[PDB]
Design a protein around this ligand. Structure first.
Ligand SMILES: Nc1ncnc2c1ncn2[C@@H]1O[C@H](COP(=O)(O)OP(=O)(O)OC[C@H]2NC[C@H](O)[C@@H]2O)[C@@H](O)[C@H]1O
Length: 505
């Protein structure tokens, strides 16, 4: 049997479980960059304000089209330099390289474009390369240079400790990412960098470097997205929300019961978690190394839903008590394989429903697990409380009643690159969801024994009526009784057998 637990169709999904969405209006906590009054279905949103307003300070994104974006000639407008550079024709890779370097002269010998030249000549066919520079690259420049006219409102930086949302259009995002592709964002490339050292990289320069055989598949995935939005302008909105909690459960005395579980070894979070809160196994610098090296769960999601990539422009590094909730992004590509075997399969027509704010019903939460430098560290109670607290922040929607919350679609969070133990992390998530009072759909990603063990454990704890606080205390018991006074890196018994034994006595 390929799944276990509650049947998947008894789990709450959006937009069916949701409360009627109230009128979309700006707020001290909500930035909205489009004309709400003119917002209609299938209609490309209008910007608000109508004409470019500029801020060049330490609270908002520094835009390439700002008058204060200067370069040494006397002080010259780098924006005029960007327009000059890109309005040239592209016949070969060198002409895009030389164009991008005109306004990034400091990095003229730190930036390699080997992956791009190979993609242009070797990987793509002639009719594919010809279509790239005669249609796709020109149409990318048009939307990039229209940034002033499309992004009229300053975009606020989502800093540590801020509970704030920014609601933006897909066309606006299209423009920003087009600018990112051409590496136009100022003050965002420094290594010794001061101001944006706590933000992820935004400019795409590293997408052209290296001799990795997966660089072309990243380009294909992004050029699939760019080709799409260029041809037919997208009409949706995307909300990015930074959540930062101060009051977490007192886990040891939490009387809340466990909730329902559906767990399967077939399918994926994105493929089979439609209308559910889909977890992104993030880096605290959101997006990971999507714009560079790195091609695992987060990056892949960031590439097939590239409108997530723009979050890197305004999202400060996540502290332990924080997550980034992105609602509205569209999936543009399909893929095969994973990491070194990842490949772009084809375009994907997203058939998701949209809400009263014209966002696609796709909620993604970025929560960073801890990167454990050795296996035994994660069982230390403070590391357990941290991961619980991170997941709990990822799942909790205060302001929404629990019966109006979808299930969470998640998986082996923290247990790939970050060396976590899936059984420990599964239980952590199940406990987090229970505190947040939501159901869990778990994808073990091809692992059947893990599915059985997770189900059996959930069932055992449910039928003995043990609450969050009792299970938490068992985890603290596991460390003290079997991990603390431990001879070699491994203890004499694993977590699950310990729980079974300790509860049965
Ligand atoms: N699409 C999908 N669905 C469900 N499960 C998946 C999927 N893709 C991968 N996985 C499973 O999740 C596991 C964890 O993936 P990984 O990307 O290693 O997550 P980590 O949290 O360990 O890694 C965090 C780091 N990696 C990329 C980020 O930028 C972080 O720096 C991985 O081993 C797979 O078993």
């Amino acid at each position: 049997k390929k799944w276990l637990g509650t049947p998947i169709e008894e789990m709450r999904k959006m937009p069916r479980c949701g409360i009627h969405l109230p009128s979309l209006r700006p707020s001290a906590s909500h930035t909205v960059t489009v004309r709400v009054d003119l917002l209609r279905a299938g209609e490309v949103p209008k910007p608000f304000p109508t004409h470019y307003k500029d801020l060049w300070d330490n609270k908002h994104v520094k835009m390439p089209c700002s008058e204060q974006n200067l370069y040494p000639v006397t002080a010259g407008s780098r924006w005029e330099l960007i327009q000059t550079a890109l309005l040239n024709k592209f016949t070969r890779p060198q002409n895009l390289k030389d164009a991008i370097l005109k306004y990034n002269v400091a990095y003229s010998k730190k930036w390699d474009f080997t992956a791009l030249v190979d993609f242009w000549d070797k990987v793509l066919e002639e009719a594919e390369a010809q279509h790239l520079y005669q249609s796709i690259l020109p149409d990318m420049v048009k939307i990039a240079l229209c940034l002033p006219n499309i992004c009229t409102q300053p975009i606020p930086l989502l800093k540590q400790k801020m509970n704030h949302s920014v609601t933006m259009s897909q066309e606006q995002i299209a423009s920003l990412l087009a600018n990112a592709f051409f590496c136009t964002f100022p003050r965002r490339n420094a290594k010794m960098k001061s101001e944006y050292s706590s933000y992820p990289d935004i400019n795409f320069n590293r997408l052209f470097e290296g001799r990795s055989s997966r660089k072309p598949e990243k380009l294909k995935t992004l050029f699939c997205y760019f080709r799409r939005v260029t041809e037919k302008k997208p009409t949706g909105l995307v909300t990015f929300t930074r959540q930062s909690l101060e009051d977490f459960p007192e886990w040891e005395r939490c009387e809340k019961p466990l909730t329902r579980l559906h767990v399967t070894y077939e399918g994926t979070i994105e493929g089979n978690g439609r209308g559910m809160l889909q977890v992104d196994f993030a880096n605290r610098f959101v997006g990971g190394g999507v714009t560079g090296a790195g091609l695992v769960q987060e990056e892949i999601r960031f590439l097939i839903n590239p409108e997530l990539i723009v979050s890197r422009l305004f999202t400060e590094v996540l502290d332990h008590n924080e997550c980034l909730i992105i609602t509205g992004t569209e999936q543009y590509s399909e893929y095969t394989g994973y990491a070194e075997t990842y490949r772009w399969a084809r375009s994907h027509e997203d058939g998701s429903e949209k809400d009263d704010w014209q966002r696609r019903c796709t909620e993604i939460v970025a929560i960073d697990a801890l990167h454990f430098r050795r296996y035994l560290d994660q069982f230390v109670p403070e590391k357990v409380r941290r991961e619980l607290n991170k997941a709990y922040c990822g799942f909790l929607r205060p302001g929404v009643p629990s019966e109006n919350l979808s299930a969470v679609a998640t998986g082996n969070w923290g247990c790939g690159a970050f060396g976590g133990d899936a059984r420990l992390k599964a239980l952590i998530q199940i406990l987090a969801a229970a505190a947040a009072e939501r159901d869990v759909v778990y994808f073990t990603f091809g692992d059947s024994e893990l599915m059985r063990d997770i189900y059996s454990m959930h069932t055992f704890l449910t039928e003995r009526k043990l609450d969050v606080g009792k299970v938490y205390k068992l985890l603290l018991r596991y460390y003290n009784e079997e991990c603390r006074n431990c001879s070699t890196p491994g203890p004499d018994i694993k977590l699950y057998p310990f729980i079974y034994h300790a509860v049965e006595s």
